[PDB]
Design a protein around this ligand. Structure first.
Ligand SMILES: Cc1cc2nc3c(=O)[nH]c(=O)nc-3n(C[C@H](O)[C@H](O)[C@H](O)COP(=O)(O)O)c2cc1C
Ligand code: SF4
Ligand code: SF4
Ligand code: SF4
Ligand code: SF4
Ligand code: FES
Ligand code: FES
Ligand SMILES: [Zn+2]
Lengths: 210, 26, 263, 80, 106, 83, 24, 426
């Protein structure tokens, strides 16, 4: 965790919120309590990440500036969270869930397939700087275990082949039907809806007295 | 399929839209 | 009024409400082994090397932190509060680099002593150790920070006693390194105090790097003449030439701190 | 941060010449009472030793850390 | 072996010497490493206890096999770093063999 | 002359001693010997340094050869390690 | 298997001001 | 005995099946008695939960009513607050992802129903940043509700004022912790605060604050609508109410069903969800509450009933009630090993025990999977395990120790053999 100034990643890379971005910046502040802006560093740091994935040392200094906080304060927030990237991020940035639930349901299986398809090691960007693969931890959505979040797409319940299909979709064209590519809606017993197969009771159903 | 498609600023911009509704600050 | 009575091993000391469990032991005279707690620095609870056992309580409490309540007898030398120290010292030492004959805080270590009095006779960490990357914090403080026990007293002093607010924690897990994210020197007066306040010898003084070793230093108590605050100081002399000047506490004038100039 | 060496009073004789030795450069001292520091449990007893032995004394009052109020909740106060 | 003197001036060989024989003062060598500017064993003061052999962490100071070092003048018996380092170079082969034989025991 | 260049001087009142008797100084000064030591290349981010021989070497220390910018130097052997 | 002279090796501890050789 | 009726099932919109949006919510009739409830009084709302005897729906189990009762004390001039943690970093907690995504409204009225119970000025919902799409769904829902005037000043045509906000998480499991959610909300690093100053007295932006699992906030309106008793009956003794159960891994149809609590463990895989993949005898072990809780071997599984205390008697925790199942086809030594890898990549490092201890167990666990380590080391890991269990500032160190303790407690012979296997091939 040390930023050794590099021509690419260093403040020479000027950063400033787009007129549109700055707008976004302010409203957030009001979301938080008055007299409190520091609390918005994360949400803001996130929009710097939205602006640019790299988020260089220059970008964090601006965040601290806009949020008038000790610069270190922003540096500490960026380092602690994995969501922020302090290094350039691939356009697609796929992340594969490899906690025990997904592994038990084959998460590892998927990995090998994706490494070959991207033809690259796990943890770095493709030469085409097209995709970046990382072994991220539990991303939620375990019921659907095989899983690979791509810029929030959160594809789910994927069999090795499915991803290759998805990756191709990403490689040529866009928006490859993000979501569980399975036949189960959101999370649903693959068998059906044992929980509630009847119609839902309407408003004020059996509302207790009092 | 609203879930199926949203922009990177959906959360933030939607929120800004909600700012007007947001009750006065402390 | 405002005088609870808490027992430290049944000594019925009486303390103002709001005194920490560690503070209650102090007035009886007992010392909770402590790291990351300095009297004039905010309580942080990072080390938890001070776990004690209030009587009739399921878990041990953080001395520096729990405000002592009414009639809770502290058991500072129980069979539990010693396994709560014999097992913490196991951890601080596990990732520690054993270069005690490099660490010029050799006899000035609050971590060998507490190991050597309250810790364990042997190690079980058959696994490998970690290493951090020495950086430059300036020309006065040598930060061989692979020594750091992440006790966050620097980050406090550098924010609370001095208003530098530069030093900070970076990252999570076992590679949380408490060093400036970008390499910006810690330039401020009051800077050298970090040396005196880091109980580990991670960051120590660069001029007094390896000129001496504390048992030898004869210590004469004298007065600061560089500035007009007249801060109290102790001049450590070996075989007749001064080797270091470090602060000695005067409540009213310099309360444990001295300027970068006068040391 | 240990305070077990700030408990007993000590009386120490005034420091004297420590000239360098020409042959080996070792420190050399002509004062016999230099390394002697006697430890006395209470201020009254130490003063007595100086009076009967005839050495001049200048007692310094013990200065103990003042009680300091601390509470983890207090710094969490955004107000201050 | 490389040729870097073993002592790193921790100075506990000085601390445990019973007779006050070893005098060590040190300063960071330009390399940045830690080395002893002056290491003086006063052999007339030394009572050859062998604790220094014991205490050294890098085992830089060792009790060498030679017992025949009787000297015409008292000054010769006082030894600085250069004599001891020279003594070390002369007897290193046997010292290494001796430490080799007894280290399992220690 | 010597390691830390002790030079009882032309005007010192101690250089008198060597008259008719030589001074003890060292060839193969150590100051330059490790500088003469090749940089131990390694694969791992961190490496150990028993000093060579375990019990016969030095306290075992793990050095972070993490930045090619700097070859870690075990504080005990002065051996530079080239990532 | 098939006269020394002792001296201090440390430097001058207290360096001494040298007077200005420029007369005034 | 489970088998709750669909009608009783609080989260009908689960699985969607009904417009998650307001018009679907109106057919759900989620906003039916909201004005009345708030009108009744804050004291009436807490009477309802005290009668319900609901336990925390998050990993920790505590009476929900007593926790809310704590900051019902008179305001000291600081605005009281509500914090809803939609973060669920624990493996197998897709439990919450449903309410947030499928039935956002239930949680919105849960927030104001809960808000007047604690007299909170406003509520902040910390949905994990990972779920960006999920966030898109709730503020659309929150926006609908205010447009309606259901929330905001004079919310639901009543004297009371409430504002609901959504906060972005940033991929941290620890952010989930009660004192650490706050600090992330405060904008400092997500490092748990210490216990003495309870979050009631100190808190978000230093004002009184309370934290609830999203399920806990969401079940509030209904518990008041259906009355504590209705809800109280389903549960068992202290245990009570239906809690969503997620079954993931080695089961024929992994799914989250809100079937009743106190369910025989053998029954929920066999009757709902999907029977254990490979047969109920192909069950090397069950993780009832998620990674933090100790796994229980098949020996007791059938006998076990899914309740907070039941598992306790069993030495395991109901927790998030995430059932992770491991067939006889899995290297548990490696399964639990990745959970310790799950915790070394995630603990904040603020406290000495957890920082070095969790890393220490990770190193030993990796050697254990290889079998390189000798048999005697196993006990040390246990000993290392309890050093970390009682000494940590937060509960995650509590959580890291339990899976290690479970592996040694029931699968000690298998680890010894892996010990033996490597020693034989030399
Ligand atoms: C390391 C750690 C992670 C946690 N993560 C979560 C989480 O993701 N979601 C959650 O609701 N509670 C989590 N908790 C528990 C919360 O701190 C808090 O006790 C709980 O959310 C309160 O909900 P309840 O009181 O309504 O059950 C976590 C606790 C710890 C120690
Ligand atoms: S700090 Fe320096 S001295 Fe104290 S233990 Fe670690 S190394 Fe040995
Ligand atoms: S540097 Fe010294 S003070 Fe700062 S954290 Fe590491 S140890 Fe504690
Ligand atoms: S001799 Fe051994 S002990 Fe004495 S200083 Fe040199 S190294 Fe430390
Ligand atoms: S246990 Fe100590 S380290 Fe692990 S998370 Fe809680 S506080 Fe941070
Ligand atoms: S572990 Fe992969 S989403 Fe829960
Ligand atoms: S000394 Fe007890 S918390 Fe650091
Ligand atoms: Zn070495």
């Amino acid at each position: 965790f040390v930023h050794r100034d590099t021509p690419e990643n260093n403040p020479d890379t000027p950063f400033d919120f787009t007129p549109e971005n700055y707008k976004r910046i302010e409203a957030i502040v009001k979301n938080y309590p008055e007299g409190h802006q520091a609390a918005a560093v994360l949400p803001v740091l996130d929009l710097a990440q939205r602006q640019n994935g790299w988020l260089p040392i220059s970008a964090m200094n601006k965040v601290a500036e806009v949020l008038q906080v000790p610069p270190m304060r922003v540096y500490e927030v960026a380092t602690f969270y994995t969501m922020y990237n302090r290094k350039p991020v691939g356009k697609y940035h796929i992340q594969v869930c490899t906690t025990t639930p997904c592994m038990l349901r084959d998460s590892d299986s998927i990995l090998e397939t994706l490494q070959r398809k991207l033809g690259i090691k796990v943890g770095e960007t493709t030469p085409d700087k097209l995709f970046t693969l990382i072994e991220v931890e539990c991303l939620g959505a375990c019921v659907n275990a095989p899983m690979v979040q791509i810029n929030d797409n959160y594809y789910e319940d994927l069999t090795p082949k499915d991803i290759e299909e998805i990756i191709d979709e990403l490689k040529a064209g866009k928006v490859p039907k993000p979501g569980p590519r399975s036949g189960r809606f959101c999370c649903e017993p693959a068998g059906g809806l044992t929980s509630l197969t009847e119609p839902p009771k309407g408003p004020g159903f059996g509302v207790q007295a009092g | 399929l609203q879930h199926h498609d949203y922009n990177t600023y959906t959360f933030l911009d939607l929120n800004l839209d909600l700012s007007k509704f947001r009750l006065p600050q402390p | 009024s405002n005088l609870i009575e808490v027992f430290v091993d049944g000594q019925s000391v009486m303390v103002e409400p709001g005194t920490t469990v560690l503070q209650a032991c102090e007035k009886v005279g007992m010392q909770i082994p402590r790291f990351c707690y300095h009297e004039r620095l905010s309580v942080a609870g990072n080390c938890r090397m001070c776990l004690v056992e209030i009587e009739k309580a399921p878990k041990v409490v953080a001395a520096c932190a729990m405000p002592v309540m009414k009639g809770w007898n502290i058991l500072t030398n129980s069979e539990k509060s010693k396994k709560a120290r014999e097992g913490v010292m196991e951890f601080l030492l596990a990732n520690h680099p054993l270069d005690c004959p490099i660490c010029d805080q050799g006899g000035e270590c609050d971590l060998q002593d507490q190991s050597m009095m309250f810790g364990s006779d042997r190690s079980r960490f058959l696994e490998g150790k970690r290493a951090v990357e020495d950086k430059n914090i300036g020309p006065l403080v040598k930060t061989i920070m692979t020594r750091c026990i992440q006790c966050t007293r620097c980050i406090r002093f550098a924010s609370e006693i001095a208003g530098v607010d530069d030093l900070g924690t970076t990252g999570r897990g076992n590679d949380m390194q408490v060093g400036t994210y970008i390499e910006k020197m810690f330039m401020s007066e009051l800077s050298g105090n970090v040396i005196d306040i880091c109980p580990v010898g991670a960051l120590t003084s660069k001029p007094y790097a390896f000129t001496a070793r504390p048992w030898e230093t004869r210590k004469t108590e004298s007065i600061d003449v560089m500035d007009a605050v007249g801060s109290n100081i102790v001049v450590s002399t070996r075989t007749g030439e001064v080797m270091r000047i470090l602060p000695r506490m005067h409540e009213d004038i310099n309360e444990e701190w001295i300027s970068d100039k006068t040391r | 941060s240990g305070v077990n060496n700030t408990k007993k009073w000590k009386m120490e004789f005034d420091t004297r010449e420590r000239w360098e030795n020409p042959l080996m450069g070792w420190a050399s001292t002509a004062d016999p009472l230099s390394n002697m520091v006697l430890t006395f449990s209470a201020k009254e007893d130490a003063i007595a030793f100086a009076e009967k032995n005839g050495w001049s004394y200048d007692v310094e009052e013990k200065k103990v850390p003042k009680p300091k109020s601390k509470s983890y909740g207090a710094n969490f106060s955004w107000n201050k | 072996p490389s040729g870097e003197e073993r002592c790193i001036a921790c100075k506990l060989c000085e601390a445990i010497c019973p007779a006050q024989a070893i005098t060590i003062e040190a300063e960071p060598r330009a390399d940045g490493s830690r080395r002893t500017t002056r290491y003086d064993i006063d052999m007339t003061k030394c009572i050859y206890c062998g604790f220094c052999q014991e205490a050294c962490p890098v085992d830089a100071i060792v009790e060498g096999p030679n017992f025949e070092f009787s000297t015409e003048t008292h000054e010769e018996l006082l030894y600085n770093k250069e004599k001891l380092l020279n003594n070390g170079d002369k007897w290193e082969a046997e010292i290494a063999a001796n430490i080799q034989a007894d280290y399992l025991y220690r | 002359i010597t390691h830390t260049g002790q030079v009882y001087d032309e005007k010192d009142y101690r250089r008198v001693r060597f008259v008719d008797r030589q001074k003890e100084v060292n060839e193969n000064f150590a100051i330059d010997l490790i500088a003469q030591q090749p940089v131990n290349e390694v694969e791992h981010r961190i490496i150990a340094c028993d000093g060579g021989g375990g019990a016969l070497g030095h306290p075992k220390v793990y050095i972070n050869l993490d930045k090619e910018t700097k070859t870690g130097t075990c504080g005990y052997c002065g051996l530079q390690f080239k990532q | 298997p098939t006269q020394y002279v002792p001296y201090s090796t440390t430097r001058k501890k207290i360096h001494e001001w040298v007077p200005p050789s420029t007369p005034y | 005995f489970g088998s709750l009726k669909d009608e009783d099932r609080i989260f009908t919109n689960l699985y969607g099946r009904h417009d998650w949006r307001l018009k679907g919510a109106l057919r759900r009739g989620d906003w039916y008695k909201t004005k009345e409830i708030l009108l009744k009084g804050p004291d009436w709302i807490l009477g309802e939960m005290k009668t319900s005897g609901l336990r925390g729906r998050g990993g920790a189990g505590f009476p929900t009513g007593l926790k809310w009762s704590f900051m019902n004390k008179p305001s000291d001039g600081r605005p009281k607050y509500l914090v809803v943690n939609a973060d669920e970093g624990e493996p197998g907690t897709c439990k919450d992802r449903e309410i947030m995504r499928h039935d956002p409204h239930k949680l919105v009225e849960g927030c104001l129903v809960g808000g007047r119970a604690m007299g909170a000025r406003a509520a902040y919902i910390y949905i994990r940043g990972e779920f960006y799409n999920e966030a898109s769904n709730l503020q659309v829902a929150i926006r609908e509700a205010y447009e309606a005037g259901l929330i905001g000043k004079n919310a639901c045509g009543s004297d009371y004022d409430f504002d609901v906000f959504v906060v972005r998480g940033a991929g941290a499991y620890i952010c989930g912790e009660e004192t650490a959610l706050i600090e992330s909300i405060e904008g400092k690093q997500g490092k748990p605060r210490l216990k003495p100053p309870f979050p009631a007295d100190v808190g978000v932006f230093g004002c009184p604050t309370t934290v609830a699992n999203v399920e806990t906030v969401a079940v509030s309106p209904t518990i008041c609508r259906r009355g504590g008793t209705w809800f109280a009956g389903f549960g068992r003794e202290r245990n009570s109410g239906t809690k969503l159960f997620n079954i993931s891994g080695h089961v024929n149809h992994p799914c989250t069903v809100e079937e009743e609590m106190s369910v025989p463990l053998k029954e929920l895989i066999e009757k709902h969800a999907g029977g254990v993949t490979g047969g109920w005898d192909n069950l090397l072990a069950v993780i009832p509450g998620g990674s933090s809780t100790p796994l229980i071997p098949k020996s007791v599984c059938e006998t076990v009933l899914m309740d907070f205390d039941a598992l306790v008697q069993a030495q395991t925790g109901l927790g998030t009630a995430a059932v992770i199942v491991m067939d006889r086809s899995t290297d548990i030594v490696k399964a639990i090993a990745r959970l310790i890898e799950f915790y070394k990549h995630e603990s904040c490092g603020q406290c000495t025990p957890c920082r070095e201890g969790v890393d220490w167990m990770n190193k030993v666990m990796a050697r254990f999977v290889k079998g390189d380590a000798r048999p005697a080391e196993i006990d040390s890991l246990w000993e290392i395990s309890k050093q970390i269990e009682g000494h940590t500032i937060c509960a995650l160190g509590d959580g890291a120790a339990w899976p290690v303790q479970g592996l040694i407690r029931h699968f000690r012979p298998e680890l010894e053999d892996r010990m033996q296997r490597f020693a034989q091939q030399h």
